[PDB]
Amino acid sequence: KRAALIQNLRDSYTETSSFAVIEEWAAGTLQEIEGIAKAAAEAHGVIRNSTYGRAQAEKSPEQLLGVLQRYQDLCHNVYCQAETIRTVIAIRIPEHKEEDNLGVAVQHAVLKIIDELEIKTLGSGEKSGSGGAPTPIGMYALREYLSARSTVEDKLLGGGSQSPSLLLELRQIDADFMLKVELATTHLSTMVRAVINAYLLNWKKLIQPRTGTDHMFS
Amino acid sequence: KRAALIQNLRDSYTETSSFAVIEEWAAGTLQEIEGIAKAAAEAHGVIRNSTYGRAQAEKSPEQLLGVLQRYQDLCHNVYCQAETIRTVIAIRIPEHKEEDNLGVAVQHAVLKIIDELEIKTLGSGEKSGSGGAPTPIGMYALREYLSARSTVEDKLLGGGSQSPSLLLELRQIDADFMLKVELATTHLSTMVRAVINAYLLNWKKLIQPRTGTDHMFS
Amino acid sequence: KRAALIQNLRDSYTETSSFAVIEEWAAGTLQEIEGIAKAAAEAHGVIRNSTYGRAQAEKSPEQLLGVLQRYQDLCHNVYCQAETIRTVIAIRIPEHKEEDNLGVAVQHAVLKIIDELEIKTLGSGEKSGSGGAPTPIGMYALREYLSARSTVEDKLLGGGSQSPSLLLELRQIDADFMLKVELATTHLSTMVRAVINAYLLNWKKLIQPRTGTDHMFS
Amino acid sequence: KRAALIQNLRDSYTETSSFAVIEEWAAGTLQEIEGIAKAAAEAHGVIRNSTYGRAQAEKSPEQLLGVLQRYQDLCHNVYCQAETIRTVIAIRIPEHKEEDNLGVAVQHAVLKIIDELEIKTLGSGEKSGSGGAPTPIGMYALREYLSARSTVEDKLLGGGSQSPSLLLELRQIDADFMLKVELATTHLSTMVRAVINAYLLNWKKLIQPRTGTDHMFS
Amino acid sequence: AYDRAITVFSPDGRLFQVEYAREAVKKGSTALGMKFANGVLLISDKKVRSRLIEQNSIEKIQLIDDYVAAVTSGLVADARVLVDFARISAQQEKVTYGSLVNIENLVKRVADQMQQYTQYGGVRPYGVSLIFAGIDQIGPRLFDCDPAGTINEYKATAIGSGKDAVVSFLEREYKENLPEKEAVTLGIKALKSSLEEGEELKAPEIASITVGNKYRIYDQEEVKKFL
Amino acid sequence: AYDRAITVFSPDGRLFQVEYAREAVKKGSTALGMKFANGVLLISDKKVRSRLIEQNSIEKIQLIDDYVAAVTSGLVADARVLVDFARISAQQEKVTYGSLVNIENLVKRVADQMQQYTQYGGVRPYGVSLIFAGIDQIGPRLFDCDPAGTINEYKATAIGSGKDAVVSFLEREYKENLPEKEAVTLGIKALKSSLEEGEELKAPEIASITVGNKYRIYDQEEVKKFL
Amino acid sequence: AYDRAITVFSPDGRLFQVEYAREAVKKGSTALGMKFANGVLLISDKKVRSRLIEQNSIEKIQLIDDYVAAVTSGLVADARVLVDFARISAQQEKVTYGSLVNIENLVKRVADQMQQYTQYGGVRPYGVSLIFAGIDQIGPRLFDCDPAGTINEYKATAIGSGKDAVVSFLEREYKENLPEKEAVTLGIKALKSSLEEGEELKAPEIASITVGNKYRIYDQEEVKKFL
Amino acid sequence: AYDRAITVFSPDGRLFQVEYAREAVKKGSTALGMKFANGVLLISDKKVRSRLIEQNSIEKIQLIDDYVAAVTSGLVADARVLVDFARISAQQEKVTYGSLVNIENLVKRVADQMQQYTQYGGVRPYGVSLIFAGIDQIGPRLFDCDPAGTINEYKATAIGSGKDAVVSFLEREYKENLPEKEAVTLGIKALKSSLEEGEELKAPEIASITVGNKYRIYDQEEVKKFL
Amino acid sequence: AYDRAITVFSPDGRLFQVEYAREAVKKGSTALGMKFANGVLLISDKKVRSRLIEQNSIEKIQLIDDYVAAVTSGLVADARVLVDFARISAQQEKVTYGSLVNIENLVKRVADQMQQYTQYGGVRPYGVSLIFAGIDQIGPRLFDCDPAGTINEYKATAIGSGKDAVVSFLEREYKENLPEKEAVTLGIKALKSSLEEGEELKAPEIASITVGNKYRIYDQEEVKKFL
């Protein structure tokens, strides 16, 4: 029975599903983003006041790994939660028509900034667009960091490289990846606040994109 | 309570938040950008009048690192401040409608040049667009420099390379990265001035993009 | 006070600021461009009449470095001066409106060929567009030259390569980079003349893009 | 005095400047292009009837260098002459308006095919568009050739490579670069003839893109 | 493209704007008419929007005169306007000739007014279909008429959302010259076949006329005996 | 596309421009009418834009004659124009026949004027709804009428922003033949249910008419006793 | 989209082209009116474009008859055309009935002319607001009227660029039944509150009427005593 | 967008198409008028397109009657048409009342015809400005009038390309009640201030009228004594 | 944009559609007129499309009456229509007053008809220029008139493709009061100056009128003596 199937979809992902997510973003999530911002700024201060010798090519700083893993855990949750809102909207896009699409326009409008959050901000894809990656750092930031550092680590350990700048680059990899988290957290906060506002102002048309009788007809 | 949530967002990022940023850009920031421009031009003069031998592949010039780190600190701040103005606007984009969008047009217009500042000018992303990087140098300039130099340093130190031009290239990497800061600062000044003007002319419609009674109706 | 801020921006970059630049371009700059053109054509003649042996892979010709550095110094100035004109226009783009945009159309029209000058002609960015680099040579020509030559220098010096063509290529790198300056200077002259004309014909609407009373109203 | 400045520009590059170029293209230039086409076809015949052994990796054939250098010299001139016509048009693009642009349309139309000639046909940029290089060979053909050949020369000389095809490839580099000149000259001829016609049909509006009294008004 | 003005033909020779008017007719309540032995009848469903509405008001079956009635479906304001044109047109004919010899001519006049609004720019068509049923000097008549100005004479037919349901049911079940009572039962039965089961048929309207009589509107109690 | 001219049907047979006119009606103050024992009443809320406004002026309840009144919602200038058409239309009928036997006909005339402006290009519809309430020879009447020219007769109904609030409350609470005093109390109670609590109901308008009498406009003191 | 023709509704039921006419009214000089003890007054500011202009000419306060006056704001050519319609309309009424019993009716006629231009394509609205003030058989009257044809009666109001300034000031400061002299002082004070300090109020226009009298235009000297 | 029809307002409440008509007026020859002791005068420049043109023909100063004259600037064919309207309008007034008591009214009639063409679709405005100068029962009068239908009374003013030059010069240099000869000199001096030096003023037109007299057109010799 | 309707102004205050009409006039055959001692003459070239055409037919010089003639250039059908308007307009004036005192007035009437078609939507302008030459009570007259309705009086002028050639030649060579024979020779010479050498002047039309006479059309033999 076709209506039963649609009803099941919608009973499972209701407007209180997507609202749950938005309440959480307004409270918990924005606070946890700020904590990661402060963890990363602090790590960046330690690295700024450090002279790096070969000693530093021999262990990976656990303070930085912690800040990076912690941000990756946030991005993981924000994405899954985004995908709840997106499910709640996507399963209520009504029959295709060339008319009565005022609400459907609100629906595509809001799906568009959830797309931006997921793809462009949480940098969650295998590959970027030909628009690039405008976000400072991805979901796979931990792996970008370890990969970038280990190339520098090998050249420094081996006869290790005698390049003074290559040693300073090991430090700049550590500095920059902490800066990249501060920047990515600032920007993720804006995006989250923007989706909070875009949702709460548009939620009615997101659930019922078409209403109205046939009052004119009998 | 949905209005309470929106009200919280807006009480936190008010127009005096975004104004605070614009005052700062008009005074402090443009001065600091000019100081960085002079620091970089001076460093470029020292390098221009230098003959480079292998001695120069053996240490990384702290004068250049200082100019680069100082620019990266500016870009970091300008970006975080940009994101304040962008939060102040983004959380007041009203209910989506196919009408009464004269102020929303001003909102998207001003968000567009904040985008250009952040992405195109502060070159703050992992990857560039297929439009390229029109900006002479990024936020991650220090790392572009150390990376470009350390490749030349290795070839020169090792039997080190005997290429006369490779030696002159080490000098040109030092010259060009200082030039790139002069150029990027010139251009960042224009962008900052442009957003100062765009903001102060449009700020009323950025906060209240829709006004008016229903005077015609009762 | 918001008007005071705007007034300060405008007092600082006036029309006589931008005019100063255009006068200089009409006289000094076009002459210096032509001198670089001649320096480069002459250096190209010397290289044309030369047979290259391994002796030539052992020093970098200072005549070509001089021509290149000299062009880079010109491009540096033309860019900073372009950015003055651009500041003078950009800080007088008026309040966004969907009407009275006849002057704003002139403003965007003239900012567009300043963009072409800076980006496309002075090749001043980290990366090119997906339109490419139509300009024969960039701001970072000296570095493109030294880099391209030092690869050939290494292969020739080392057992050095026995490729007869690789030797001829060292000569062509020297010839081509002088040709590239002649071409780039020809083209830059057209662009500079084009902006002189575009400015002087349009300057009034560039400063006051909207005028007129409310004569119709009282 | 602003009119003086414009007058100087225009007195220097007049219509007889641009006409001079077109007369030359009609006579001298199209002949010299055909000579280069024949020089290259003939060189291609010699290579076709040749068996290549290692002897051929040991010198660079001067017959091919001569054809290539001769084409590069033509492209150099055609570009500098194109830029004259372009200067003559560009300095007469009148005040920006949203009306009376019938001539300005002719001006942009003819500038467009001069762009096609310079960029797309004379392949005169550092980088191609994302449209590609539709032209068979560039201005920097000589360098593309020597570079392609010297890679094959090294592999063949060194134990030199025993690859039968690599030896045949050295021959095909020689063949193809002569074919590429035949093809590029054919195509350059069309483009030159096309600009001859486009100019002579449109020259009056190129110089005076707006005329007419205010006969209707007094 | 060819879709947006009443005066525009499509390349296949269609007037989509008129075809679109026809879709407005599908949004109305279902009604049907049928001929039986010496007479004709109408039955109409009705949206009852609320219990705060007044039942004995705005009727779907409307008398044009004592011997002719109409039911309509589609835009209600358009329908009202057309029914009043129908009534004034009827009285003009009576005044000219003293009587209405052939109902087909009243229908044509109404259909021509409708056709006219499918040809001149500056007006849209009426989004309405009508069934006219009455007795004239030919005998019992049953016509329908749509936004295009198309006319047909039937033994039985219907208009409204449930049209297709009701026309199939009747294609299978209708016979000519039934007695009134059986005709009305067939009609109620047909009407029910268009509902979506679960959904049940409240009090509908029923009018009937037989040769030598005037029209007769069934009251809700009389109607109830068939539910 | 199909959105931008009164004369254009959508492919589903809709007149969006008319539907849009209907949105204008939602921007008015809420008003309601209801029938009670031997009579009908109207109650209207009112935007009081300022304290510099004059209260005893531009009334939401308007007499059409001594036995008929209207309330309106939507574009106020349109509404004013329609009320005066209604008044002149009433007097024309009285001059022709000596009285107004059936209010439904006045309403239809006003509704037809409205329908006309949903069919001919070069005009937009009136962005107005009206409720008419009065006594005629049938009895107490209560009608509404929208920009489409659609008409319904009710026991109770409402128009304005708070329409849906007020119609639910009445779907649950309304009984027929209440005494006047209780009908008025039910009305005030229903009206309050449409406000957003915190927000409180200032002095609204109340008019009533009973069989054999003329209308009677409640003064602000009499109204107060119900607040 | 929905922005570009007087006959088009927006999906929210708005007439933007009329809302835009309303912006024309903000570009005029500020004027205000207010009721006081047995009378009403008008005060108007004035752009003085140059010293080559003639002062005793094109007045912002215009008499409609001896007992009614109007101030206007917005497009001046429209305002002129509307004031002459108002005068001719006033005389038609006096010829028909011998007098002008209720000024509200004059105003409505003017408001209707304006409303009409917000409904039929082929015309744009008048970009004008007006304040009418006078004495009639009800008493002292004060009305405004805008491009949409909307009307309100006030105790005090204003129109022009400084409207919002002046209305706030009066919301705080106005009292009813002031003597004429204090009323005028309050008015000048209110007007000043709308200027941008530095900027100073030159000679404005002042007219007043009290019950049983004709209008009275203050000359520049009498006005000066209040500056 | 808001730029392309006389009937469209911009969102700031402007009529660009009218503003554009106003640009057509800047393309005309400069002319000016001024009031002096017991009189008023006009002076007009003139494009002399060739020496094959006939001088004593198509005059920039045109008499409307013996006591009123006009100069115009803008589209010449529009100006011709307006001047003849002005003349016929003047004679209608004289036939109705026997005389032209107040020139302001003639001007208003002309200005109204112009305003009308800024409001109904299907026409474009007149791209013309006029100055009217004459004597009436009030005294010497000087008015201007533009494509919008806007009117002002002046002591001195100008129209045409050199307007702004001439108005500045007069803002500095004009005094009231000069004798005729000095007034004419001031005018010629002003006119010259608008030319671009090198460029020299050929024979212009000069007409003048003083109280109790008819107009008086200066011939080219009399004009020459001032060059 | 501003290019595509006669009712639209460009932002610089231009009517491009009228300027385009003016280009239609450049496509015609060249004709010229000039005043000489006590008279005026016309000379016209002519496309002779084939040898199968009839010469003594469709003449470029057309009599309006015995004392006034016209030559035209541009769209031929528009020109025909305007010449007939001219003739009828002439006869109306003669019937009203008994004679045609001033030819400038005939011209203005024709020019006004043309202007009218540059202001009301739904018509395009006439793509025609005319020269009128005749004797009236002022003396010998020579006017031209274009699609815009613009008028000038000349001593000599021309219209058609070769206009600019012929006007230069005359700017250098014309003198006033030549005898007829020399005037005609100067004219033929001028006309030839506009041809493209190689190309030679076939038999053109020549008409002339002197004070106290009627027009006089030169026959092809008389014309030949000047070739």
Side-chain angles (χ1 to χ4, degrees), chain C residues 48 130 161 163 165 187 190, chain D residues 60 73 83 87 96 130 153-154:
Chain C
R48 187 192 277 286
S130 54
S161 173
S163 164
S165 294
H187 185 44
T190 297
Chain D
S60 284
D73 293 340
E83 282 281 327
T87 292
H96 189 94
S130 54
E153 286 168 13
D154 261 37

Side-chain angles (χ1 to χ4, degrees), chain A residues 105-124:
Chain A
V106 174
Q107 287 182 329
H108 293 306
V110 172
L111 286 173
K112 213 186 156 145
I113 55 155
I114 284 172
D115 286 350
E116 180 173 19
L117 180 77
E118 298 196 42
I119 290 150
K120 292 291 172 179
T121 314
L122 300 176
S124 64

Side-chain angles (χ1 to χ4, degrees), chain A residues 15 48 102 130-136 138 144 161 163 165 172 176 179-180 182-183 187 190 197 201-203, chain B residues 2 10 60 72-73 76 79 83 87 90-91 93 96 98 125-130 140 142-143 150 153-154:
Chain A
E15 195 281 325
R48 187 191 278 286
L102 287 183
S130 54
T135 186
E144 291 168 54
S161 173
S163 167
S165 296
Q172 207 56 52
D176 284 0
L179 172 75
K180 289 186 160 182
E182 306 180 45
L183 297 180
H187 184 46
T190 301
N197 176 60
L201 297 175
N202 292 289
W203 69 267
Chain B
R2 294 149 187 273
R10 298 186 185 171
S60 286
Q72 183 184 247
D73 294 335
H76 175 242
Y79 183 102
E83 283 283 323
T87 291
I91 74 192
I93 288 158
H96 188 95
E98 314 307 314
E126 292 156 284
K127 287 199 158 154
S128 296
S130 54
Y140 314 119
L142 204 34
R143 170 141 192 236
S150 74
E153 286 165 12
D154 261 39

Side-chain angles (χ1 to χ4, degrees), chain E residues 3-4 17 20-21 23-24 27 50-54 57-58 75-78 80-81 117 122-127, chain F residues 1-2 7-13 15 35 111-112 115 118-121 148-150 153-156 170-171 174:
Chain E
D3 195 25
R4 244 154 272 205
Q17 204 58 229
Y20 290 178
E23 292 296 299
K27 306 198 190 278
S50 175
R51 62 118 200 170
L52 294 179
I53 283 282
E54 271 279 8
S57 208
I58 299 80
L75 296 165
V76 289
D78 290 5
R80 185 181 63 245
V81 163
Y117 279 52
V123 286
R124 67 173 173 76
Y126 298 90
Chain F
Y2 305 110
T7 59
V8 176
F9 275 104
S10 73
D12 288 341
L15 301 171
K35 296 193 184 161
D112 284 343
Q115 182 279 336
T118 84
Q119 195 160 19
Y120 300 82
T150 306
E153 201 184 344
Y154 295 86
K155 293 151 182 303
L170 284 168
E171 255 144 348
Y174 176 84

Side-chain angles (χ1 to χ4, degrees), chain H residues 3-4 17 20-21 23-24 27 50-54 57-58 75-78 80-81 117 122-127, chain I residues 1-2 7-13 15 35 111-112 115 118-121 148-150 153-156 170-171 174:
Chain H
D3 196 24
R4 244 154 272 205
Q17 205 58 226
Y20 292 178
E23 293 296 298
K27 307 197 190 278
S50 176
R51 61 124 198 161
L52 298 176
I53 283 281
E54 270 280 8
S57 206
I58 299 82
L75 298 164
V76 290
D78 289 3
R80 186 183 61 247
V81 165
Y117 278 53
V123 286
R124 68 170 174 73
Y126 299 90
Chain I
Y2 306 109
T7 59
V8 181
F9 277 106
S10 74
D12 291 336
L15 298 176
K35 295 193 184 165
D112 284 337
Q115 181 281 332
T118 81
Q119 195 163 19
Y120 301 82
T150 304
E153 202 185 343
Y154 294 86
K155 293 152 184 307
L170 283 171
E171 254 142 348
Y174 175 83

Side-chain angles (χ1 to χ4, degrees), chain A residues 63-77:
Chain A
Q63 204 199 339
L64 310 207
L65 293 150
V67 169
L68 292 159
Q69 181 84 63
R70 192 168 148 202
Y71 181 65
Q72 183 187 243
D73 295 342
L74 180 97
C75 297
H76 174 245
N77 299 333

